Structure formats: C-alpha cells, structure tokens
Symmetry: none
Subunit: 204 residues, 2 copies
C-alpha cells in the first residue's frame, strides 16, 4: 500500500498552515515538530536524504495549495500545436509550471514563444483539470492544470535538424503523448472545444 | 523494526496536546484534523510496513508556483451567497485556499459546506483572476483566484465557528466586502455571469 503518501502530505500541509497562521509560541512549536516528523517519514519511506526532503517537500512559506501547471491550446487549420521534450521523446502542448510574478495568460504567452517561437494573444479559458485525477502517479505534490486557448498573431515556428520537435497534429494523427503533461481525453476535449467553442468549459 | 508506528504516536501525542491547550479556533481545527488522521493511520495493521517509494522526489525540483484560492458563486433568487468571518467584520463568498488532495470543485463544495452548511453541485467554471492585478495586499503572496459557480441542492443553513453570518445579497445592496478575498469588480462580473450565462470567461 502507498496510502501513506497522502497522509504524510496532509500532515505537512496542516503543519505548514499552522506555522503561517498560529500566533501562539507553543503551538507554532508543535506545528514545527509536526513538520519535521513529516519530513522524517517522507525521507525514510522514499529513501531520500533528510535535507533534500526538507528542501523539496517542506520549504514553502504560507498556506500549502496545489501547484499550477499551464497548457496552451493553439490551433492552425484544424491541427493542434505540440512540442516533444528532452526527457520523454513524447509530445506535449506548450507549457509548464506557472511562474510567480506572471498571470496565467502571461505564462501561456512565454511558454509558446519559448517552446515554439510563435507569438500569441486573444486568450480563452478552456478548462482546469486536476492532474492527480487524470494523470495519476505517486507524487509528493498536487497539480492543477489550466488550459488556455491562444491565437497566433506573429512569430515563426521553430526549426530542427534530424529531429522533428515542433509540429501541429490533426485529430486522427496524434503523436505519442506525454501522459503526465496531457492525457488523450484532455487532448480530445480541446478538439471538442474546437468543433464547438461555446460548450461547457470543464472543471474537475 | 517498522518506524511508522512511533511517528504516528508522536503526531497524535502532539495534536492531542494542541487541542487540549489551544484557545484559537483555527489552531484547534488544525489539531483535530491531525488527531483524526493519526487515528485513521493507527487503525491499520501494526505488523505491516508501508511500501517504500524511491525516486518519489527524483523528478521534482521544489519548483514554486502561485497559490490557489477558490471562490464559490452561488445564487438564490438573484442574490449572491456571502459569508462574514470575524477578524475584520467583512464579507466574502464561500471559499479559501485550495488543499492538496482536492479537485477545484471539491474545494468549492467543501468550503461552502463548512462555512454555510449547504450542499452544492452543478459546477461551472467562471473565471481565473490574478490576485496581484485586482487586490494588491502588501504581503509577497502570489495567488491565482478561481471562481466556480454552483447551485444549492441540499444541506441546512448552518452558521459555523469561523463564520458570524451567512446571507444572500442582491446586486444593489452589497455588504462591506473583504477586498482581499473579493473586489467589487469581481463581484460585479459574477453578477454579469448570472445575467448572461454565455459571457466569456475572464482570465488575467
Ligand atoms: Gd515546458
Ligand atoms: Gd476552515
Ligand atoms: Gd474561507
């Protein structure tokens, strides 16, 4: 069983919350002890160095919420824009982690420019999917995925020698998907939005 | 040797002291959470250890994104559901930070219930606002604010311990708004979603 992952995540989150909001020196202290126990459990049951765990799992200030992933949904002539990335050799919509300081649409703009060379605007909110519901894997965190539609208003598509790396793909010729970044049904949903742009915008 | 046993004992031992001693309702709610979980972990078989999940942190870098706030938009008879927390005697839609382990709609449901006693369903994605763009509050915290409409289907009007008053207000009679949790303009746009259910979703 790996139910423990969720329990430990909950414990740390509540300890993190306590440390942010408690104003009582003795309870703040209790929360801190509680945070350290959670690091120790995590460190032991993943076989990961304590300080590494503290960094990656318990170094955040303020209340703990899921993290934000942005995916940009760009159509040219009925085909959807994908990028293949280093690790997988598998294809994903342009996007990534949402940066502090940047609005959801700004992250979408930056990631499209960076990953594809295209310049985008006229943004549409299309869906928010829960990562843990749609592409589950044992994970220390929890991820919300915002899909934002964009129109190409400029720039130009990246070029790549000997490797295909940025293409548009049609509904019946989808490439090998990076499931962690987008599931098949998530992609399908964007085509359903394509064929009927006024439909229910999905939220998990 | 099975190390999870004594870690869970400490968690309960500490959370037990926490809820015996603390006179802060928020801290109390946190320690009761921690007591529940430890109990839920205790009830498992005490001779079995947890599956080790190595490389749980192999993929992750500790990357930080903006936090997530969820606001529920609930209309009864053309009036919008507001909640008054004590601190400042000010009014906000049911909502709050999203928690690890919950989908966005699960958050909205959970906070409506806790704060008001109502059961909601029939979720509809309305808007994602960037917090820094609408209600700059001197803290450093970057927050994405998801507005999710939904409908009462059951429950009971129940005033909790964190909440002084639960009331619905029409567009021309808005209470003194907690600007931090919701601006007057965001409230206005929510009313425009009611008038026109095909209004374009706002996204910063
Ligand atoms: Gd990327
Ligand atoms: Gd509460
Ligand atoms: Gd609240």
């Amino acid at each position: 069983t790996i139910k423990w992952i969720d329990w430990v995540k909950q414990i740390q989150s509540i300890a993190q919350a306590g440390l942010t909001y408690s104003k009582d020196v003795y309870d703040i202290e209790r929360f801190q002890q509680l945070r350290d126990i959670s690091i120790s459990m995590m460190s032991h049951y993943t076989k990961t160095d304590w300080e590494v765990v503290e960094k990656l799992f318990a170094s955040e200030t303020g209340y703990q919420t899921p993290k934000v992933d942005i995916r940009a949904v760009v159509f040219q002539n009925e085909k959807l824009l994908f990028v293949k990335e280093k690790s997988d050799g598998k294809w994903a919509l342009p996007g990534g982690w949402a940066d502090v300081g940047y609005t959801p649409t700004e992250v979408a703009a930056k990631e499209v420019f960076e990953e594809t060379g295209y310049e985008v605007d006229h943004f549409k909110l299309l869906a928010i999917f829960d990562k843990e519901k749609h592409q589950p894997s044992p994970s220390a965190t929890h991820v919300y995925k915002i899909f934002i539609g964009c129109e190409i208003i400029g720039g130009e598509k990246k070029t790549s020698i000997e490797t295909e790396e940025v293409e548009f793909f049609g509904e019946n010729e989808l490439p090998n998907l990076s499931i962690a970044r987008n599931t098949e049904d998530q992609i399908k949903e964007m085509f359903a939005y394509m064929k009927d742009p006024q439909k229910e915008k999905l939220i998990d």
